[PDB]
Amino acid sequence: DFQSESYKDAYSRINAIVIEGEQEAFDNYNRLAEMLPDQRDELHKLAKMEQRHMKGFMACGKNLSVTPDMGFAQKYYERLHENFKAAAAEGKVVTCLLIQSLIIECFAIAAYNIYIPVADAFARKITEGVVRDEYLHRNFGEEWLKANFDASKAELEEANRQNLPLVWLMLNEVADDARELGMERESLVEDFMIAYGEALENIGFTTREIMRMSAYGLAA
Ligand SMILES: CCCCCCCCCCCCCCCCO
Ligand SMILES: [Fe+2]
Ligand SMILES: [Fe+2]
């Protein structure tokens, strides 16, 4: 349990996934800072927080004597990451904000909070510090999208349709290794659906709209 060979194998993929995720979050928020001049300094602050998270999780892996399987993690994020990239190239800020500040942050919040109670004491302290920042990142995107809801609504719907299923696939792909780390799938699914559904309601979506938007992920 922590030093077991089964735990260490699963941690190799999970730890690689969180590190790769933080690294991409870093790049994502820097690109967003390019696209949103009025919030350029705030977004740069979010990016610097991501760099800290990445470093903290690299340390978690070293503490369990685990080599992160980065190749597995690259492939894990590829589709969703390339979608961000493409949206960024076409100037689609709304899509980029949805992917990184809503969908990805909600996923991280739900998984990290599930990991905390079963995490070794060193990783538990790191993750507690990390999840504190994730609330702020999600709050940034919700606040912006809520303030710009009418202009953003049509693109949000389209972005959700294309990208929510990718994250569900990512949630499903990670479920086995997560269980080995003592994180139950059913907790992950419920918590992610609740957080993302609640964030959509806060932004301004109706119930039928939230059910429609959620169902694109769940049917995948
Ligand atoms: C060592 C941490 C354990 C939790 C593992 C969670 C399993 C997969 C979810 C990964 C989500 C990473 C997203 C990071 C984005 C940060 O803004
Ligand atoms: Fe982060
Ligand atoms: Fe984040």
Numbering used by the authors: 11 to 230
Paste lines from the article.
Cyanobacterial aldehyde-deformylating oxygenase (cADO), which catalyzes the conversion of Cn fatty aldehyde to its corresponding Cn-1 alk(a/e)ne, is a key enzyme in that pathway. Cyanobacterial aldehyde-deformylating oxygenase (cADO) belongs to the superfamily of ferritin-like di-iron proteins and contains a di-iron center.
The only exception is molecule B in the F86YF87Y structure, which contains the di-metal cluster while exhibiting the L5 conformation. As a consequence, His147 moves away from the active site with a 9Å distance to Fe2. In addition, H63 is located more distantly from the active site, and the ligand bond between Fe1 atom and H63 is broken. The iron ions at the active site are bridged by the residue Glu60 together with a water molecule. The two iron atoms are maintaining their tetrahedral coordinations. The relatively low coordination number in this structure indicates that the active site is in a reduced state, and should be highly sensitive to dioxygen. We assumed that the hole formed in the F86YF87Y structure serves as the access channel for the co-substrate dioxygen.
